Design a protein around this ligand. Structure first.
Ligand SMILES: COc1cc(C)c2nc3[nH]nc(C)c3c(N3CCNCC3)c2c1
Ligand SMILES: [Mg+2]
Ligand SMILES: [Zn+2]
Length: 305
């Protein structure tokens, strides 16, 4: 539709009301960002449908989250087009769509605490290493290799861009990454032609995209909070059955602590993320402004309004 082609370019865009159109919205974004002759359309369409099939029916880490994260990346890339190569633009849009593949609704700490087989196989960034392994398995299916036309060198480079992008969605790594970028920016040392600086900037873009549900209009942001919390409470219920007391955010008997938990998450994680992203990429400012608006809505809930 002509109506949506205009709205897809904006940062605040909510995909929510167009479920049947999500596969077509992704194809359109790859076409406008990387060109209409980037991939073979038959191969791309099979890949998108196999990716959709490998997202589980969980309240938050599902097919909708994947398309939401991919659309945020598209809007960042469209507002900063010439800072990235054709291989990076295609690698990053794919990485976002595949970033939480086969998520079972449990965090890394639960899998490490209860010594699940995935934790023995992957000791750090447990789920993110699993998300990358699932992406490679889907690429290796008959008629799913979207990167068939690349040279063997370019195939290895794009898989390495994707691997680093998926691993960077581990929030535990974000804190140290953001502190380095903030230092590099203030001292005037940041340089995008330095490959180590480039990977860190890409990592922060991935965090900004993964947390973008805090940058939508208030009625949408508050309905997404219900879905994150239904996942956290289900994990906390399992910890209770196994004789371990869960942290407050994962405890369904401590809902009163949520508005204050959100205020702390916005001040310590979300606001610094979008602040540093705007300093490095000024056109991303609308994400920071939307985040400040939802912070001020959480301030209003705490004060009783
Ligand atoms: C782990 O501790 C927390 C604690 C709080 C209070 C959170 N509040 C949030 N609001 N919106 C989002 C999104 C979100 C969080 N997530 C960050 C990315 N990983 C999924 C969960 C949060 C994560
Ligand atoms: Mg993830
Ligand atoms: Zn995610």
């Amino acid at each position: 539709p002509v109506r949506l082609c205009k709205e897809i370019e904006l940062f605040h865009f909510d995909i929510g009301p167009f479920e049947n159109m999500w596969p077509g919205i992704f194809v359109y974004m790859v076409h406008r960002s990387c060109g209409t002759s980037c991939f073979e359309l038959e191969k791309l369409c099979r890949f998108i449908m196999s990716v959709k099939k490998n997202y589980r029916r969980v309240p938050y880490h599902n097919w909708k989250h994947a398309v939401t994260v991919a659309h945020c990346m598209y809007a960042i890339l469209q507002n900063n087009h010439t800072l990235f190569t054709d291989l990076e633009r295609k690698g990053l849009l794919i990485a976002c769509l595949c970033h939480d593949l086969d998520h079972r609704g449990f965090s890394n700490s639960y899998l490490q605490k209860f010594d699940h087989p995935l934790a023995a196989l992957y000791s750090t960034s447990t789920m993110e290493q699993h998300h990358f392994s699932q992406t490679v398995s889907i690429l290796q299916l008959e008629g799913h290799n979207i990167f068939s036309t690349l040279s063997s060198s370019e195939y290895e480079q794009v898989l390495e861009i994707i691997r680093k992008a998926i691993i960077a969605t581990d929030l535990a790594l974000y804190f140290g990454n953001r502190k380095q970028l903030e230092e590099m920016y203030q001292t005037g040392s940041l340089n995008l032609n330095n490959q180590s600086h480039r990977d860190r900037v890409i990592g922060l873009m991935m965090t900004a995209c993964d947390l973008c549900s805090v940058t939508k209009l208030w009625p949408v942001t508050k309905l997404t909070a219900n879905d994150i919390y239904a996942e956290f409470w289900a994990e906390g219920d399992e910890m209770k059955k196994l004789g371990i007391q869960p942290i407050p955010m994962m405890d369904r008997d401590k809902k009163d602590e949520v508005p204050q938990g959100q205020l702390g998450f916005y001040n310590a994680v979300a606001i610094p993320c979008y602040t540093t992203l705007t300093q490095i990429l000024p056109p991303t400012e609308p994400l920071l402004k939307a985040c400040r608006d939802n912070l001020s809505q959480w301030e209003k809930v705490i004060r009783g309004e």
